[PDB]
């Protein structure tokens, strides 16, 4: 009858006319060449390189068996033409699966995403369910690795199909699905790995996932405050580095300035002056109060306004990862300025005290002399009042009502950066800082000449009044081009021009 011959070609077994009127051969090739793709699949999807490729390979055999189930089920012996028409709406789909595979071929995520773009490309048509059932199982193992960083945190990779592979401790290199969740997964895992050492709407994935991301991060930040006192370290480093606590800088700087080369630089005096300083603090002497390594960074040789010296805080592991080893370096930048400021309010205090013992001696030469100090002191006691208003109070209002895990890195990087910006240390407003040195220098010369050389000092003060009068113009011209500098005008200029 020949029915059992054509039907035994979709299975792959050869026949009397299938090797490996008269026009029936042409209409036979319409069903024959269908079989050439069925065999061309088992030769390609037989193995049980990549793990996601195996599942997609394991998904194909979940389909062909149905194609083997449909055949040999309905027709015992039907008309010849019935076969060609019955296997048309289904046969052409089998030839479509040849365009998908080879009969090179991506692997890993590159394949799990390539198959996705085949869905939207041919969505409305009848190829939607078959492709979907493949994608629904071709991503099954890939969810498991995603199901590790979310629940357990053990990274299980074999060949690199995962898009992510494996002091600083944050060198798990990272670089389709919605990127709104991609970068979040990368951080939703590193937190767990850090606590261990201490229509195509994708709703079936994010919904069981986003519910767990917010609980981890909230428990991660809460882990820091209520147990490791992150809120304390900030409000403690400010007590020591930014010199917020009086009776400490006025005891440290006051000690060092008593000396001024080979002395004052061995670790016997400068590494001990701190342990004498902390006792006069009336605040501290806690586990926080330690780790104040008063270390130096230069070996100078020999009237100026510079004494290079550093003061570094020290931290331990679960806090080292937040407070960057670069941020503390910038505290050292803002510190050497603030210490340099105290050198004025002590040297200027000296001449105010050095002159006190001189007092009978009342003449025009005397009173006209002392009014210089009153005219120079008021300037420094103004620029200091500015610093003690921006870098310690208002920039601290932010970053204190701002906090209440990635954000902690940026919020801190924004707190200090505003402190060095309002501090006239940025290179943008550098000329405003350069002129300050001319002011500070002249006060030191005024300290050297503690009336044998009055006129030598009278010329010095006149140079001071010129430079100060020059500052009022260079800062004003820098307003048309910084709302931070605005408050300086109201500070330097008041009831004058």
How would you describe this structure to a colleague?
The protein has 497 residues and is mainly alpha-helical. The protein folds into three domains: 3-105, no CATH class; 142-227, no CATH class; 230-492, Gamma-tubulin complex, C-terminal domain (Four Helix Bundle (Hemerythrin (Met), subunit A)). The chain has 20 helices and no strands. Helix 15 (327-354) runs antiparallel to helix 16 (364-397) and helix 15 runs parallel beside helix 17 (406-421). It is rod-shaped, with a radius of gyration of 40 Å. Keywords: Cytoplasm, Cytoskeleton, Microtubule, Repeat. It is found in: Cytoplasm, Cytoskeleton, Microtubule organizing center, Centrosome. One of its GO terms (biological process) is cytoplasmic microtubule organization. This is Gamma-tubulin complex component 6. One of its GO terms (molecular function) is gamma-tubulin binding.
Number of domains: 3
CATH superfamily annotation of the largest domain? Gamma-tubulin complex, C-terminal domain
The CATH class designation of the largest domain is Mainly Alpha
Instruction: Give the second-level CATH assignment, the architecture of the largest domain.
Output: Up-down Bundle
Q: How much helicity do the residues have?
A: 55-70%
Q: Measure the end-to-end span.
A: 117 Å
Please write the string of helix (H) and strand (E) elements: HHHHHHHHHHHHHHHHHHHH
| CATH fold field value of the largest domain | Four Helix Bundle (Hemerythrin (Met), subunit A)
Largest sheet: none
Report the portion of residues in β strands.
Answer: under 5%
Sheet/helix structural class: mainly alpha
Taking all Cα atoms into account, the compactness measure Rg is 40 Å
PDB class: structural protein
Keywords: GCP6, g-TuRC, microtubule nucleation
Assembly: monomeric
Entry title: Structure of GCP6 in the native human gamma-tubulin ring complex
């Amino acid at each position: 009858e020949l029915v059992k011959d054509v039907l035994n070609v979709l299975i792959g077994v050869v026949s009397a006319t299938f090797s490996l009127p008269e026009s029936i051969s042409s209409l036979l090739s319409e069903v024959a060449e269908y079989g050439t793709c069925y065999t061309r699949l088992s030769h390609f999807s037989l193995q049980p390189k990549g793990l996601v490729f195996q599942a997609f390979t394991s998904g194909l055999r979940r389909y062909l068996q149905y194609y083997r189930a449909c055949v040999l089920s309905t027709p015992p012996t039907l008309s010849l033409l019935t076969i060609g028409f019955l296997f048309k709406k289904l046969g052409r789909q089998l030839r479509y699966l040849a365009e998908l595979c080879g009969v090179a071929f991506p692997t890993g995520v590159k394949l799990l995403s390539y198959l996705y773009q085949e869905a939207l490309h041919n969505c409305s048509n009848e190829h939607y369910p078959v492709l979907l059932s493949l994608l629904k199982t071709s991503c099954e193992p890939y969810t498991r690795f995603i199901h590790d960083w979310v629940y357990s945190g053990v990274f299980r990779d074999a060949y690199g199909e995962f898009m992510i592979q494996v002091k600083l401790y944050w060198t798990h290199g990272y670089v389709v699905f919605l990127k709104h969740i991609a970068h979040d997964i990368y951080v939703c895992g590193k937190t767990i790995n850090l606590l261990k050492l201490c229509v195509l709407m994708k709703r079936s994935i994010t919904a069981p996932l986003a519910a767990h991301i917010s609980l981890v991060n909230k428990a991660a930040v809460d882990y820091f405050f209520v147990e490791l006192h992150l809120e304390a370290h900030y409000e403690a480093l400010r007590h020591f580095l930014l010199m917020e606590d009086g009776e400490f800088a006025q005891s440290l700087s006051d000690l060092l300035f008593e000396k001024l080369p080979g002395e004052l630089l061995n670790p016997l005096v400068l590494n001990s002056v701190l342990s004498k300083a902390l006792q006069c603090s009336l605040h501290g002497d806690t586990p926080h109060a330690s780790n104040l390594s008063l270390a130096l960074k230069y070996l100078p040789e020999v009237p100026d306004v510079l004494s290079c010296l550093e003061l570094r805080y020290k931290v331990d592991w679960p806090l080292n990862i937040v407070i960057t080893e670069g941020c503390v370096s910038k505290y050292s930048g803002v510190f050497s300025f603030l210490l340099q400021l105290k050198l004025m309010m002590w040297a200027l205090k000296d001449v105010c005290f050095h002159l006190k013992r001189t007092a009978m001696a009342g003449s025009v030469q005397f009173r006209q002399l002392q009014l210089f100090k009153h005219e120079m002191q008021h300037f420094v006691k103004v620029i200091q009042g500015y610093i003690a208003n921006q870098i310690l109070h208002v920039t601290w209002c932010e970053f204190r009502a701002r906090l209440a895990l990635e954000e902690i890195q940026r919020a801190h990087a924004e707190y200090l950066h505003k402190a060095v910006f309002r501090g006239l240390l940025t290179e943008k407003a550098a000329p405003v800082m350069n002129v300050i040195h001319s002011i500070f220098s002249l006060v030191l010369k005024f300290r050297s000449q503690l009336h044998p050389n009055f006129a030598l000092m009278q010329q010095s003060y006149n140079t001071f009044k010129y430079y100060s009068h020059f500052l009022f113009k260079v800062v004003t011209k820098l307003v048309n081009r910084q709302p931070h500098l605005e408050d300086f005008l109201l500070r330097i200029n008041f009831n004058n021009y």
